[PDB]
Ligand binder design. Sequence first.
Ligand SMILES: CC(=O)N1CCN(CC(=O)Nc2cnccc2C)CC1
Ligand SMILES: CC(=O)N1CCN(CC(=O)Nc2cnccc2C)CC1
Lengths: 304, 304
Amino acid sequence: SGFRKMAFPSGKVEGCMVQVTCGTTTLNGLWLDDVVYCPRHVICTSEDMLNPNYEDLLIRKSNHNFLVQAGNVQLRVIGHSMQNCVLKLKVDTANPKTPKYKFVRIQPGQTFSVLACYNGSPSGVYQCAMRPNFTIKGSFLNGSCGSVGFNIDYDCVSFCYMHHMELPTGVHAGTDLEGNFYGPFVDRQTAQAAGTDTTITVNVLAWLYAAVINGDRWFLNRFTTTLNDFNLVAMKYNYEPLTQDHVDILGPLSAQTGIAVLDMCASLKELLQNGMNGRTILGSALLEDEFTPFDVVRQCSGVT
Amino acid sequence: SGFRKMAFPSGKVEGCMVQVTCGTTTLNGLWLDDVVYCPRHVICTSEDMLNPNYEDLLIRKSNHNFLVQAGNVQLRVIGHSMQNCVLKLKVDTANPKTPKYKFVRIQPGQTFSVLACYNGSPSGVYQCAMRPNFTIKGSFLNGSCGSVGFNIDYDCVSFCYMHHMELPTGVHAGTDLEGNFYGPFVDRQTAQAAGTDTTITVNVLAWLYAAVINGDRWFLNRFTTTLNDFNLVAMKYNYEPLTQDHVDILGPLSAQTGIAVLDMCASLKELLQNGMNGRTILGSALLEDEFTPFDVVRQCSGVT
Ligand SMILES: CC(=O)N1CCN(CC(=O)Nc2cnccc2C)CC1
Ligand SMILES: CC(=O)N1CCN(CC(=O)Nc2cnccc2C)CC1
């Protein structure tokens, strides 16, 4: 028992972190096989930042300008290329610590762990969700670019995010490992609109199931609702509309607790309409949406 | 910017996790140099659990009864001994992945990361605080015993906790790495009183400084208070009394923000007396006490 905002063990990803320096800029790189991936803005200077011409800036750079260091060992760069907003630096040595891995583009509302790094050195690990508006609310300071987000399925690391920027609002934006930004963001120091965000309804329901499993039950009521009725409340409270696909993903949790998904929706409806009345659920005084139904099942069964 | 409940990178500790089986019971062990540490209750059976005579139960066991497996490799046990509530199994091979390490007994109110493990395999990592009453509110299922808590100072891992039990209240208890329980707990399946707990005042203040640094400032007011006055409020709201030692530890945060510690106390006093009024601080709707002043400084400066 107990429910915590748990991150994946970061060991397999720590073994891939390197430092990348180009000119005066230092950030993090991800060394997998004989390739180091890093944000392309490592080639920018302070003036360039406002509207960089990345193709022109990269043409001024040669393999020897990319200084890549894995702790104490220096890597020899034998190729460089830009793919979307990432640079791929081919090195002459395959990372001996390369885990089994995949590059995946996650969906908004899915969760992942972030290994925050500075100068190629890991500082901490935390779990977070890709917001419906494609931003993440992380903890990143200057030098954290190139830190990655990932999930782990037994021995396979699926990298889903590489950190690129902090928007003027203090929220974070980045790319998949092919350098495509999540959301409308660009790697420029410009004010950029993040879409209207919503709360991830399916995750809040999953977390209400985690609460019941772990003994927090005060919010269960004598009511039920329909998807239509619930979605009118979700609309008023800026929650994602619930679909049958979300109900289907909550199936295992519904089966385990014996609480029908629409009955849990009626509990969530009453919490949205009345608040928590100064009470808590799993140590939180708000409705948590950073746990997917998969996360809840995994934590509640002890998956390694 | 951004502030997250960050755990230490778990790689150095993942490399130490092993599985220990004695009879029908399997739990986790910590392999450091040529010693494997694990909870002594690995030698109990269902009947024994209520009041085990550990000295007698261990006398029935020989080195060959302790099956220790590090992933796929089997370790050869050449000695066994009980120290307080831990067993130390001497093995014939020093762990090649042994990091620089220390065994420390943490103080109540201090924080640490837990690497939750099942069958010697890491499942996740989360940060938590040792409650003032010496319990932890973790996420542990059957098989998680032997999972450890730790802090990391650059390359040195200070192990401070080994998980032993879940109290009937769903809270967790364990020992330091010398097998001494934190708090009054014993390794028996008996109802056990956990002391009256309090909120870690110095940590809530540290977290209010983290909030101001990261832009959440709505709670700052035109008031000040004294340690005496603040401590009358702390008393009413079951917060730890604030001392000059706590004020001194908040010094760096006070210097960085320019907000005197007693002025932050007056903000905390108003939040205790009036609540959050449906607002949030760093994504939380309650007063968070799981970040020490050290944690706040480290996260706000990017320490690796
Ligand atoms: C070079 C360029 O066009 N830019 C504009 C500056 N950015 C730098 C940037 O966003 N850093 C950063 C990331 N995360 C947290 C904190 C900070 C300070 C990179 C992309
Ligand atoms: C052998 C003995 O005297 N006991 C009594 C049983 N306990 C087992 C125990 O507390 N397990 C556990 C730990 N954490 C979360 C969930 C569970 C189920 C070990 C100590």
